[PDB]
């Protein structure tokens with residue numbers, strides 16, 4: 590049974606541009622679309638005109654706006670945002686039937702933050718206060734929600750990739766998935782949920798203990814997989830891997846798929862590759878298994894993704910009926926990032942109450958009739974020291 594009908598199908602978007610949920614801020618309520626971001630911890634919204642924003646938070650029109658008289662500056666690798674801190678009443682229309690007073694960073698300047706055509710106007714950082722900006726005294730949204738209401742301290746995400754390109758109209762009209770606030774909806778997954786511990790409450794940090802490509806062990810010291818951390822991050826597109834793991838994985842994926850040769854720019858995630866309509870050779874590309882530490886001592890389980898997850902559908906650079914994709918695995922210098930293309934394979938339970946992350950096969954993962962994504966266990970013979978310090 591699906592017990593959270595009110596919140597099922599409340600997301601829209603896609604791996605290229607992000608998955609978002611509708612929220613309201615202020616009194617009377619101002620509706621905004623907000624990126625669901627498990628890899629940061631600020632609730633930050635556009636609050637001044639911008640060429641890529643169709644709307645924005647207007648603090649002067651909110652009777653419940655409270656000015657904290659404090660700026661926040663947030664540079665990150667790909668860009669930056671800065672703005673002004675305050676609080677206001679916030680609700681999620683397709684969410685729990687509650688309204689909370691939460692911190693809001695009113696974005697006044699940004700660089701490469703907003704995405705033309707994404708249809709979102711702010712971000713909902715769902716990770717922990719430790720990585721909030723300017724510091725850990727700025728209570729994140731979810732903490733406020735839990736403190737102020739009877740909502741259980743847990744949320745779950747089903748991100749649904751289409752498996753093909755969606756034009757602007759289609760992505761607006763399409764259901765992109767679900768964020769279930771306070772619970773687990775059984776209709777969103779098949780098979781069993783398997784849980785891995787949250788190593789530390791800052792990012793949603795986990796520990797990978799083994800990596801296989803088509804069943805072949807990458808055979809790296811498991812610390813390499815978590816150097817310098819491994820996180821589950823809905824606010825990143827790709828599966829990102831530490832440099833040395835990336836190099837070893839790409840070598841192995843190339844070897845598995847070697848019946849076709851792809852240019853270097855494809856493997857660099859820059860260049861698309863295309864096949865005649867319907868003829869994408871899924872079967873030449875390997876499955877990828879990530880083994881995660883179990884809750885039981887000396888046990889692990891694995892999550893297995895298909896090329897239908899790690900090849901991201903993109904429309905052709907020229908007009909055609911070809912099926913085209915970009916390689917959605919890329920190198921990282923800040924650890925492993927299980928981004929949206931990985932999350933598209935799975936229903937993911939962020940069980941904050943029990944300090945654990947659950948994975949099950951998603952009811953909306955893209956596959957073919959020969960192979961599916963999998964979550965399987967337990968495995969009891971693995972060497973598990975895998976965390977980086």
Ligand SMILES: NC1=N[C@@]2(c3cc(NC(=O)c4ccc(F)cn4)ccc3F)COC[C@H]2CS1
Pocket residue numbers: 603604605606607608624626627628629665666702704712822823824825826929
């Ligand atoms: N997890 C991260 N969150 C941050 C962030 C994320 C994004 N996300 C996206 O555009 C995006 C697009 C496609 C996707 F499938 C997912 N996300 C945009 C701005 C931005 F600042 C906020 O804190 C650090 C920064 C960099 S890593």
